[PDB]
Amino acid sequence: LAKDVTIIYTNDLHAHVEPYKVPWIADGKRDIGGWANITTLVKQEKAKNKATWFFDAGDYFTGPYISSLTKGKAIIDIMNTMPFDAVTIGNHEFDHGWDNTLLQLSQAKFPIVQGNIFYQNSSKSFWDKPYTIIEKDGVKIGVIGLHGVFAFNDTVSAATRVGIEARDEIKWLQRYIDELKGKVDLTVALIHEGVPARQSSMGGTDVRRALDKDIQTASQVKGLDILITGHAHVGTPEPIKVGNTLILSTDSGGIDVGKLVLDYKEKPHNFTVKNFELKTIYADEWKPDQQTKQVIDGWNKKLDEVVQQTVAQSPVELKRAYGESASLGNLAADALLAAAGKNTQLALTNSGGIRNEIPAGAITMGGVISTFPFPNELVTMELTGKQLRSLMEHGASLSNGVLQVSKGLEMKYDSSKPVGQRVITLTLNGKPIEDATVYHIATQSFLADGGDGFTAFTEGKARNITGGYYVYHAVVDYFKAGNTITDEQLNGMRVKDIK
Ligand SMILES: O=c1ccn([C@@H]2O[C@H](CO)[C@@H](O)[C@H]2O)c(=O)[nH]1
Numbered sequence: 001l002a003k004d005v006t007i008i009y010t011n012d013l014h015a016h017v018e019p020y021k022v023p024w025i026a027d028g029k030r031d032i033g034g035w036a037n038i039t040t041l042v043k044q045e046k047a048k049n050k051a052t053w054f055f056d057a058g059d060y061f062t063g064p065y066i067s068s069l070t071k072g073k074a075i076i077d078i079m080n081t082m083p084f085d086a087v088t089i090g091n092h093e094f095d096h097g098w099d100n101t102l103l104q105l106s107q108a109k110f111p112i113v114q115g116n117i118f119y120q121n122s123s124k125s126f127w128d129k130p131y132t133i134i135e136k137d138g139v140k141i142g143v144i145g146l147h148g149v150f151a152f153n154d155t156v157s158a159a160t161r162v163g164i165e166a167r168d169e170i171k172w173l174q175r176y177i178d179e180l181k182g183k184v185d186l187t188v189a190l191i192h193e194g195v196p197a198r199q200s201s202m203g204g205t206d207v208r209r210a211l212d213k214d215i216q217t218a219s220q221v222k223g224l225d226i227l228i229t230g231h232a233h234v235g236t237p238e239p240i241k242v243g244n245t246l247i248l249s250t251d252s253g254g255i256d257v258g259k260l261v262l263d264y265k266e267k268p269h270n271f272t273v274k275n276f277e278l279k280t281i282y283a284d285e286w287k288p289d290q291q292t293k294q295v296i297d298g299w300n301k302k303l304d305e306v307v308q309q310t311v312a313q314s315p316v317e318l319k320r321a322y323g324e325s326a327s328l329g330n331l332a333a334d335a336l337l338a339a340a341g342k343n344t345q346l347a348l349t350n351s352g353g354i355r356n357e358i359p360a361g362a363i364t365m366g367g368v369i370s371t372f373p374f375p376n377e378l379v380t381m382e383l384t385g386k387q388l389r390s391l392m393e394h395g396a397s398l399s400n401g402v403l404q405v406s407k408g409l410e411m412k413y414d415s416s417k418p419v420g421q422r423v424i425t426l427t428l429n430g431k432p433i434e435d436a437t438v439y440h441i442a443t444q445s446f447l448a449d450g451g452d453g454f455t456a457f458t459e460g461k462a463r464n465i466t467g468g469y470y471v472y473h474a475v476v477d478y479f480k481a482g483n484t485i486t487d488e489q490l491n492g493m494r495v496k497d498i499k
């Protein structure tokens with residue numbers, strides 16, 4: 001009666017539907033990922049072994065323009081061609097508003113689980129299905145979907161979650177564990193939680209990211225067999241054992257896919273790990289599933305006319321960094337400053353909002369959208385020097401990366417100092433920022449409402465928001481207005497760790 005039970009999982013796929021280059025993998029010279037390749041991988045596993053499940057821990061939206069320009073519709077369409085047994089809902093599924101979340105995810109032909117997001121001051125749940133039971137070859141797996149409260153408040157834009165909220169994930173996890181006890185062979189939780197992923201062209205040396213939250217979660221509940229996590233984009237080359245729970249994750253974007261083979265016996269109810277592999281997907285090692293590819297191709301054809309348009313050019317690949325300035329952040333802040341105009345003195349934008357490199361050569365509308373994919377609207381406001389400095393300290397804490405800043409603003413911090421005391425110098429046009437002085441600043445609506453823990457933005461006065469005018473429009477308009485990429489945008493270390 002002993003049975004091979006196989007769990008295959010992804011997380012944080014982020015709309016990377018086609019194979020793509022990653023600067024820190026084979027020096028950006030080898031295609032990785034591709035959802036059509038992942039489909040072949042899973043179909044082949046499911047053909048070999050009946051008791052095979054495919055799960056995803058959220059954040060399949062947001063990234064390459066195919067997601068943003070369709071508000072995620074194309075992503076659900078493509079996912080409908082893939083053999084998912086269950087997924088949960090990550091923060092990025094909310095990027096186009098929670099009404100859009102309901103609208104698009106209603107179209108999914110695979111099960112979606114989410115049991116701890118509620119209407120505020122209500123017992124009513126946001127999603128209809130907190131968990132579900134998926135049985136294959138006499139083996140029943142109960143799968144629970146949850147979002148960390150901290151991560152929900154930290155990374156869902158304020159404007160897209162008005163009137164909804166995540167609630168104590170630990171309380172709901174134990175409740176659902178207890179509700180499933182005696183009804184299933186194995187209990188799995190898909191939990192979207194923790195610190196946000198680093199957004200960087202440099203990979204792992206650019207701000208440490210770990211899975212401490214998930215270890216905490218596992219150690220706070222009893223009776224959970226597997227915790228699949230997403231949100232931090234930190235893969236687990238071996239399962240992390242906490243008590244009797246295995247914690248599993250991937251590096252995100254379809255770079256790798258996890259595969260856990262268990263030996264299971266229902267009679268003496270026991271599972272033991274038989275084999276685990278976190279497999280790097282190299283496009284040239286896989287035949288893409290033709291149906292998945294066809295749906296992707298049909299969507300690209302629809303979008304081509306809009307995205308193909310040339311908006312600029314760059315002599316070099318434009319890069320991003322999470323702990324310091326990089327060219328894409330310098331350009332985005334300069335574009336925001338340019339678009340705000342008038343008396344604006346400086347612009348700030350978040351490192352986590354910059355999602356891809358822009359390759360060298362002709363820059364197209366699609367490339368700009370893939371890099372700056374958020375409906376985050378231009379906001380101008382007045383902040384004191386003291387408030388600006390508090391924002392800089394929050395950035396230097398590296399919990400959510402540093403702010404990227406406009407030309408003229410320079411910030412130096414020391415990451416070896418205690419959080420709260422890391423800013424060394426902060427100057428605008430060579431003069432120190434002064435506590436009581438009032439500065440005219442530009443940013444966007446995600447930061448303006450306190451996104452990423454940047455709370456002092458919410459104290460800004462004389463606030464003005466431009467509806468429908470996003471970071472990517474500002475960037476496009478920057479090149480339309482005559483401006484080009486400058487050497488100081490390319491090499492200027494406006495924000496720098498002097499550790
Ligand atoms: O509207 C949004 C929502 C999220 N994010 C970014 O996405 C990261 C999570 O992947 C967050 O830390 C934040 O920087 C934005 O930039 N804008």
Ligand SMILES: [Cl-]
Nearest residue numbers: 148150151194
């Ligand atoms: Cl969390």
Ligand SMILES: [Fe+3]
Nearest residue numbers: 059090091231
């Ligand atoms: Fe996330």
Ligand SMILES: [Mn+2]
Nearest residue numbers: 012059197231
């Ligand atoms: Mn993610």
